[PDB]
């Protein structure tokens, strides 16, 4: 069968599959709420596993992890206003929700607003935060980052609220959940799997905060603002009731209590084995767990997982679809605590995944609205994405998704809370995440109002929209597994390299003052460019029929993402080793961060660090070009 045949069969299955019904079913009482490792999470895990069996997939299996999670306990979580002596003035709130991995502690101090708690928000404040409590609005960055930023400026605790403007919620009393681990995975098995075989040694993640953090209602936030002075910058665009700093006599005391529980979590898997190279595979993944009912958070994605696995199984069993490479379907737990189930799988089976898993597709929050189609991914996937948007139609308008020629230059990189992030940044598996989306965040995420009722009321076209999410991901699967080319565009890294060199070129004076040079970086970027041209030439001249020469060429494509994983750092201590998309002092952004500080001239710049960064970034790029180029003896 040809691409056209497979596209139509998919279109058909799609036309008949019932998306809203699947989502409605996942919102039933047996599955709600479904905090990771809870009875109801387990119930949904068994459902999903049993469905996979019914679909008659090549193989259905499960992994079990025991992970440590700090959760709300029976004691008081409270924020109260306190006169300058400690005497109660007013209880503000006993919040319903919590922030996992918060420090358990009670702290008292001034309250200072820091907008979203970005580094620049902190830079631009007139009020100093040293020794005071911070209040920040949800949005823009993760809770974990908000807290880390605050803690780095010696703040003593954090409050998070949803402002009316950015989050138009009628009910002002609404609670909400999240976590503050600056990381993914079980914080207590950093860089290795949460399996009994490890016997759980003492080991703690650098990403754990050391101050307390708590979510509060808008009601609560307003009560606090009524004890505070200073108009919030209008460029914050928050509500009028916003204020910046506690009045002179007034403190606030934050008390949070939690307990560290060992929790059993389940990842549920099926595979459709490939027909030619079954040992290579794509992975398709969705978070199953959530605080609250999690219709948008987890149900939409889980529904897509199910229907995709079903349709693909029909296509193979009935319409003669023969993918050359395999397809794994993964239903993850403890996504709500930082992609924990996914991360532990990656850490557990890295040796099995290496150069075998060649792409990951995430399904979480694929439907939040209908206005925009937004995507984040490895550059390796951009072309596939482009082709898919040019032939898939918007569910509301009837028009193709590809409206914007320059879309690729506006893509934001995967962030810490997206489960695709570890796939790319840690294991170096090209990954993609995508959504139908508004300009607003979907406001019920992490709340008890994330229900089917709310979702369909807000998105009446849900079924058509979900159908369109499914078609995007299904086309990815087919293009990725069916052909004898991979649809991984290595040439996309040339413009990433240009961007990097261009940014660095701004600091040529600093380089010159240090007696350093950009020649070798320039030269390595040229080597990478030439290596991609040769490879594309080899593809053009290949006997497509000839499976050996096609395997040789394709295996070179399958090493590209990997070779951007820094080989110089400890994967245990710095797991996001990808020099482009990862985190830490080995990345390319970090190198610029440091060098920028030289103009600042504050003794913030670390020259020894920067010299080592430049060396290793240079060689990582050069080494990638060299390897892409062919055999050792053929390098110039």
């Amino acid at each position: 069968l040809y691409w056209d045949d497979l596209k139509r069969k998919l279109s058909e299955k799609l036309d008949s599959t019932d998306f809203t019904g699947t989502i409605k079913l996942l919102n039933e009482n047996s599955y709600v709420p479904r905090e990771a490792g809870s009875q109801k999470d387990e119930n949904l895990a068994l459902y999903v596993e049993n469905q996979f069996r019914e679909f008659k997939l090549s193989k259905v299996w499960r992994d079990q992890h025991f992970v440590k999670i700090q959760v709300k306990d029976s004691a008081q979580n409270s924020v109260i206003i306190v006169d300058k002596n400690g005497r109660l003035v007013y209880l503000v709130e006993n919040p319903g929700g919590y922030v996992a991995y918060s420090k358990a502690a009670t702290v008292t101090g001034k309250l200072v607003h820091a907008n979203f708690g970005t580094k620049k928000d902190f830079e631009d404040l007139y009020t100093p935060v040293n020794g005071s409590i911070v209040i920040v609005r949800a949005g823009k960055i993760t809770f974990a980052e908000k807290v880390a930023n605050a803690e780095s400026l010696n703040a003593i605790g954090v409050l998070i609220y949803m402002d009316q403007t950015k989050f138009p919620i009628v009910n002002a009393e609404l609670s909400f959940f999240g976590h503050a681990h600056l990381g993914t995975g079980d914080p207590y098995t950093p860089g290795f799997p949460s399996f009994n075989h490890t016997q759980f040694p003492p080991s703690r993640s650098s990403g754990l905060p050391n101050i307390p953090v708590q979510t509060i209602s808008r009601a609560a936030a307003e009560k606090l603002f009524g004890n505070m002075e200073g108009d919030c910058p209008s460029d914050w665009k928050t509500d009028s009731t916003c204020r910046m700093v506690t009045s002179e006599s007034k403190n606030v005391k934050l008390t949070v209590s939690n307990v560290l529980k060992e929790i059993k979590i389940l990842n549920i898997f099926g595979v459709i084995k490939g027909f030619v190279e079954p040992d290579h595979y794509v992975v398709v993944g969705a978070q199953r767990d959530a605080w609250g009912p999690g219709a948008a958070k987890s149900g939409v994605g889980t529904a897509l997982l199910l229907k995709l696995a079903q349709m693909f199984s029909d296509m193979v069993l009935k319409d003669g679809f023969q993918p050359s490479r395999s397809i794994i379907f993964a239903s993850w737990s403890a996504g709500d605590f930082g992609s924990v189930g996914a991360t532990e799988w990656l850490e557990g089976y890295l040796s099995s995944l290496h150069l075998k898993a060649f792409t990951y597709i995430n399904l979480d929050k694929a439907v939040l609205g209908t206005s925009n189609f937004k995507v984040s991914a490895s550059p390796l996937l951009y072309t596939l994405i482009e082709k898919t948007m040019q032939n898939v139609k918007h569910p509301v308008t009837g028009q193709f998704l590809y409206q914007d020629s320059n879309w690729a230059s506006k893509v934001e990189k995967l962030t810490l809370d997206n489960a695709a992030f570890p796939f790319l940044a840690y294991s170096g598996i090209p990954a993609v995440s995508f959504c139908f989306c508004e300009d607003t965040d979907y406001p019920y995420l992490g709340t008890t109002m994330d229900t089917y009722k709310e979702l369909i009321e807000r998105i009446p076209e849900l079924n058509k929209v979900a159908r369109a999410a499914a078609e995007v991901a299904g086309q990815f699967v087919i293009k990725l597994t069916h052909d004898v080319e991979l649809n991984l565009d290595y040439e996309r890294y040339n413009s990433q390299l240009l961007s990097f060199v261009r940014d660095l070129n701004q600091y040529r004076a600093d380089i010159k003052e240090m007696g350093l040079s950009l020649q070798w970086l320039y030269s390595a970027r040229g080597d990478f460019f030439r290596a991609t041209s040769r490879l594309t030439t080899d593809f053009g001249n290949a006997e497509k029929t000839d499976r050996f020469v096609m395997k040789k060429l394709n295996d070179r494509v399958m090493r590209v993402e990997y070779h951007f994983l820094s080989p110089y750092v400890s994967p245990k201590e710095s797991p996001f080793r990808h020099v482009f998309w990862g985190s830490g002092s080995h990345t390319l952004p970090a190198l610029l961060e440091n060098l920028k500080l030289r103009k600042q001239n504050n003794g913030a710049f670390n020259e020894t660090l920067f010299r080592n960064q430049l060396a290793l970034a240079t060689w990582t790029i050069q080494g990638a070009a060299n390897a892409l180029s062919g055999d050792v003896w053929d390098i110039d």
């Binding site: 599955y31 709600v32 709420p33 479904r34 905090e35 990771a36 959760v71 709300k72 605080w291 009912p293």
Partner: peptide
């Protein structure tokens, strides 16, 4: 409304 048995879906103290 969450169901009356919501706690079974919670590892956090309900």
């Amino acid at each position: 409304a969450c169901p009356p048995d919501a706690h079974l879906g919670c590892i956090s103290w309900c």
